């Protein structure tokens, strides 16, 4: 999983201000890193169905946040998914 | 306070003469500590610090 | 793994080939090669002494080091090749001093790893050890029967032996045939199971695929006349006789083992 050291590094790169950690950009960035990290766990444990329900949840959460940005600030959205490759 | 599987002397009074874990309705220990009691005895049994049963 | 063929032809409808994309696509190491011509299952009298042999593709013989007498000299797996002479794959070894050899390939053995031989060797797939230096319970192959003679047992694709234990100067083994056997503890074995574990899983698909392998058609004995087979004879279809070979020997349970000098090397067999 993601450690504290790198988790704070993604926040520091997607900061919308001083130690916010709550903006749609930082949340989507945190979910994106977490989702990609779990791709290694599910490659070795594909029968893990109870953990995968958790993975879908943050995939669903990330989609809801991206929908919110697209409706809120289009420029903030097209730029964010350019960095995250979504 | 705290419980470990190396408290063999302390684990003796929570196990019966034939080696079964005493239920909480007798000793009166808390549910939280009984769970820690059970796993510590289970580990001590594995290391041959406590008998599984009194005939082997 | 296996890959089914599309039914584009009736001859391709049940072709299920084993495919290994990790095995060498080039040619075998030239110096470890020998000319080898088909015999048609004929002996020095020119007589068919084993039927249904004849035909097939020309193939060289790869000289497999079944002995592994280069002890305490590490060798690295140069490449894993396909061998037409056997069902197992073969690893091209590359010894420190530059000498190159072929060995049977373990399933858990890739290109680049180092393989060891001798008595002070790690317990990893590929290493060749005397049966006393192998802990009980590990899965082995390439079992020696005589000391210094080379691997005899467990040499086919997917072959494996269970080292059950020791009872003195013998080593109790459990062969894939279900027979428990004792072997001198000074004999050698290789760690791991033999590669190409999905060989029995294949399907040739058509009569010509068996012709490519040197196998000729087989005629059932009840399709013959009584002058050719004990099963031959009859108006219409009929067996009439207890099942038997064309030489008059039962083929439905008659045990055929003559050895009385190796009878003490066999602990038991398995009933199922």
């Amino acid at each position: 999983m993601l450690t504290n050291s790198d988790r704070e590094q993604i926040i520091a790169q997607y900061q919308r201000g001083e130690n916010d950690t709550g903006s749609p950009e930082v949340q989507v960035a945190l979910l994106s890193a977490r989702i990609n990290d779990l791709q290694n766990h599910f490659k070795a444990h594909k029968a893990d169905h109870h953990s995968r329900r958790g993975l879908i949840r943050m995939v669903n959460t990330r989609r809801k946040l991206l929908d919110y940005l697209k409706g809120k600030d289009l420029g903030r959205y097209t730029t964010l998914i350019s960095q995250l490759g979504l | 306070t705290h419980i470990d599987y190396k408290d063999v002397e302390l684990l003796k009074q929570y196990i019966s003469e034939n080696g079964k874990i005493v239920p909480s309705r007798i000793t009166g220990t808390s549910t939280k500590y009984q769970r820690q009691l059970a796993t510590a005895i289970k580990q001590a049994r594995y290391l041959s610090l406590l008998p599984y049963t009194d005939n082997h | 793994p296996i890959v089914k063929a599309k039914p584009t032809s009736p001859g391709r409808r049940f072709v299920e080939k084993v495919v290994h994309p990790h095995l060498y696509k080039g040619r075998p190491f030239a110096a470890l090669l020998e000319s080898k011509s088909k015999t048609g299952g004929r002996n020095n009298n020119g007589r068919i002494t084993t039927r249904h042999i004849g035909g097939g593709h020309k193939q060289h013989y790869r000289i497999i080091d079944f002995k592994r007498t280069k002890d305490n000299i590490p060798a690295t797996v140069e490449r894993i090749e396909y061998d037409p002479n056997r069902t197992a794959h073969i690893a091209l070894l590359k010894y420190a001093d530059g000498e190159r050899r072929y060995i049977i390939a373990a399933k858990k053995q890739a290109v680049g790893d180092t393989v060891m031989s001798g008595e002070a060797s790690p317990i990893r797939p590929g290493n060749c050890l005397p049966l006393k230096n192998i802990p009980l319970g590990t899965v082995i192959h390439n079992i020696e029967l005589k000391i210094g003679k080379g691997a005899q047992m467990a040499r086919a694709a997917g072959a494996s032996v269970q080292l059950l234990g020791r009872d003195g100067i013998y080593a109790i083994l459990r062969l894939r045939s279900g027979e428990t056997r004792r072997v001198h503890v000074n004999c050698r074995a290789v760690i791991g199971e033999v590669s190409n574990t999905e060989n029995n899983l294949k399907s040739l698909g058509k009569a010509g695929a068996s012709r490519w392998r040197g196998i000729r058609p087989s005629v059932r004995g009840v399709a013959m006349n009584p002058v050719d087979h004990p099963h031959g004879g009859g108006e219409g279809r009929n067996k009439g006789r207890h099942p038997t070979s064309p030489w008059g020997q039962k083929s439905k349970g008659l045990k055929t083992r003559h050895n009385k000098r190796t009878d003490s090397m066999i602990i038991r067999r398995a009933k199922k």
């Binding site: - | 290391l47 041959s48 599984y52 | -």
Partner: protein, 102 residues
Amino acid sequence: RHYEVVLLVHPDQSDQVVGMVERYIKLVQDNNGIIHRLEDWGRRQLAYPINKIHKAHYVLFNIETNGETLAELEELFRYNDAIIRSLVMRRDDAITEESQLA
């Protein structure tokens, strides 16, 4: 990640236990490992007969190491033929004080 490992050595092979412990000690200390505790409980009367013996030698030593070195340790214990039993734990903290058994 801290680990608490307890070994069960055969009583006959208790003469090389000191050389057995240091072999793992040097292995852990080599790979940036810290030995927070080490004690020899000595010969102890087993609760039940393991492998047709009634007494055995107990060794406990809490260590800290990485996953790679722990895999090396577990392999050594299994192929040792003197360690008749072993128990590896994952401890959240580092334990240094002498255990109540010693």
